[PDB]
Copies of this chain bind each other. A is one copy, B any other.
Amino acid sequence: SPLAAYEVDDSTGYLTSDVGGPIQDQTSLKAGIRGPTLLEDFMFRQKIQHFDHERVPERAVHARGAGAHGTFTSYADWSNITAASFLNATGKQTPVFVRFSTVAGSRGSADTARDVHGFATRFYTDEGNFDIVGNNIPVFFIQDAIQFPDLIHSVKPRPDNEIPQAATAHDSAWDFFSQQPSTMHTLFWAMSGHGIPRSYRHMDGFGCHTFRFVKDDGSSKLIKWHFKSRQGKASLVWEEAQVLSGKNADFHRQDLWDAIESGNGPEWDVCVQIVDESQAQAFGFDLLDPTKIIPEEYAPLTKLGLLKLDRNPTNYFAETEQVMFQPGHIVRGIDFTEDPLLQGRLFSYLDTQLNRNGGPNFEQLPINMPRVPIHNNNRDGAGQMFIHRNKYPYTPNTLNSGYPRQANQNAGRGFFTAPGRTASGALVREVSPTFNDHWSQPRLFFNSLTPVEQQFLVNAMRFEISLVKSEEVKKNVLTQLNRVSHDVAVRVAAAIGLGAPDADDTYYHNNKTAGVSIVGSGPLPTIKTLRVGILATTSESSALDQAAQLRTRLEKDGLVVTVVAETLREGVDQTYSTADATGFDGVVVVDGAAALFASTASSPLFPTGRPLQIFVDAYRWGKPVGVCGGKSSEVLDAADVPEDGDGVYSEESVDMFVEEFEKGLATFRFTDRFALDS
């Protein structure tokens, strides 16, 4: 590991300058005890110069994100489908680093903004670094990389006032979506629960583009990358995400950090869809078009290996902030396709690192280094950390005996372009007519959601478009939505008091596809790491005993338990003052704490109505909630929470309460609590 050599231990020792001279750093050097600071104070200036220069430009997109180390393990020798060395043996392990992100927000913006999310994975392979720079949504808004600044300017804050942060809920974004109909598929995904995932662990990763697997014999197949979560799929609801943005902007990065620290490092099956070159247009769309999925009914997933994240960084800046992904980080056995979005990405990711790093030697940062020898004639540049021994860095040479040697299909395990690839025709700035259906697959996605998930997506569009000031942009939005679904256009129009256009059935259909629904993906396969808030009181010795009971039961099953009370003490983790329903996946009130839930209840130690507000918010947001201990009756009445409700638990027995409640945690959300359009 190039990181091991660069770890710096400051657990002992005297303070030094950056050149090893022992110094102090607490008082400036002055001309007398009340005098002016001296220019000759090098201790002051070296420390303050460093501080003054700590920041680097944030990523132009995906600025908000968090990373972890782990391991990829191949399930098989995949030589039969690719030459890729990291996939060439059963059990072969490759170190990884992953960064997850949002897209639009700056640094410091909230994790739980509604957005597309990044899922970028580096494989430090034995034949070079290989990055799969993916998103949690399989389709992208645009069909040509040249349009990326148009999309990103439109979603980012308006440039006169830089409002709003981390949001599409403004005129410019919806102007762009309504004028550029390619955007509909990703927009539908972003307006679904996929826009507000419960955690980075509860979302999938997608390469989006078609790539190629290339064998050593030169043959190739077309692939899509799918990283399928072993934790299951889960979402927040919007009114919860909005509160969580304020209460804990760091929720997704803490969730990931904690899961790794507790030995619950998240896992994905790294999968591909594999199809023949001859099927590029066989599925009713073009595989070069990054606004399209291959429905799993036409091409099943093959599991290639296991990705596990199991180690947090040491220094966030050095590792997470400085990791510099590139789809140009490719290895023998993988090739590009003529997807015009992918094509332009290859340029952008090499160039943008110059902005971030300030110089050309960014691959020398430890997080960016490979785990094999580097042999090339790249030289000099600001920040050059190598001392090259070859004083003849040109090819062809005799004075270095012809080294380094060219690598290609028949030498040195070189990368090679798939040799069956061709190009024909005019040099054109023209869009393929094969790309022109912008509406069928958005309809397929919408059809594939459950009725309450459809309602959530309509409600997200109603929320955002109601904040668009331009009546004209709003009419144009309804025109495009109407081409996907007349019903969606009518339901969205109702919230903004406009009439939807008449049905236009050109692209309407009733087809569905597996694997895109969150609500329909069934109970979570594991409840480990899910958060249970136990609302208790210091008033009643009964209440802390009940809490301690529930804690033992729930912690045995790997749940993260928080006992909440008025004040901290033995067994209490959190005060009411700092507690919020956004902090829990389930909420339990111990019946000993009933008095805290009365309308008349007041304390200087927390805001008026806090304990009850936690319970009511948890219920209203669809979470499993209950009262444990025998007078389950009251509390449920204070909350107007019906005791016969699905996901509402009422038991005197802790054993019975927990058994029932944990089934609620797997269900995760009780969708019967949300009203549907008639």
Contacts and interface: CB of A to CB of B under 8 A. Distances in A.
A563 to B, nearest CB: 13
Contacts of A466: 568, 574-575, 577-578
B56 A57 contact: yes
A423 B36 contact: yes
Interface string A155-166: 001011111111
A51 B148 contact: yes
A618 B185 CA distance: 39
A569 B247 CA distance: 33
Given A37-B340, A245-B246, A675-B604, A52 B162 contact: no
A149 interface: yes
A352 B55 CA distance: 10
Consensus secondary structure, chain A interface: loop
Interface residues of A, number: 143
A496 interface: yes
A34 B286 contact: yes
Contact of A247 (B25, B246, B286, B354): B246
Contacts of A31: 423-425, 427
B44 A459 contact: no
A347 B44 contact: yes
Instruction: Give the one of A55, A56, A348 with max B CB within 10 A.
Output: A55
A144 B28 contact: yes
Instruction: Give the one of A24, A161, A317 with max B CB within 10 A.
Output: A161
A52 B239 contact: no
Contacts of A90: none
B149 A427 contact: no
Nearest to A574: B466
A431 interface: yes
Contact of A352 (B53, B347, B568, B574): B53
Interface stretch (A189-197, A248-256, A372-380, A519-527): A248-256
Given A316-B161, A348-B48, A459 B675 contact: no
Interface in A153-193: 157, 159-166
A63 interface: yes
Interface in A52-69: 52-60, 63-64, 66
Interface stretch (A107-115, A407-415, A438-446, A508-516): A107-115
Contacts of A312: 160-161
A37 B344 contact: yes
A115 to B, nearest CB: 12
Contacts of A675: 602-604, 608
Nearest to A320: B162
A633 B644 CA distance: 31
A9 interface: no
A391 interface: no
Given A315-B159, A355-B53, A344 B149 contact: no
A282 to B, nearest CB: 14
Interface string A85-128: 00000000000000000000111111010000000000000000
A121 B29 CA distance: 30
Contacts of A243: 243, 246
Contacts of A314: 160
Contacts of A28: 144-146, 340, 343-344, 429
Contact of A58 (B107, B356, B467): B107
A552 interface: no
10 contacts: A27-B431, A30-B427, A30-B428, A43-B429, A48-B145, A108-B165, A112-B246, A162-B320, A166-B249, A497-B568
Given A161-B253, A161-B316, 19 more contacts: A25-B150, A31-B424, A36-B343, A43-B429, A51-B148, A55-B355, A66-B162, A109-B249, A161-B313, A242-B246, A243-B243, A246-B247, A458-B604, A459-B604, A459-B605, A497-B572, A603-B675, A608-B620, A608-B675
For the complex of A and B, 6 pairs with smallest distance between CB atoms: A246-B246, A32-B425, A106-B108, A108-B109, A245-B246, A106-B107
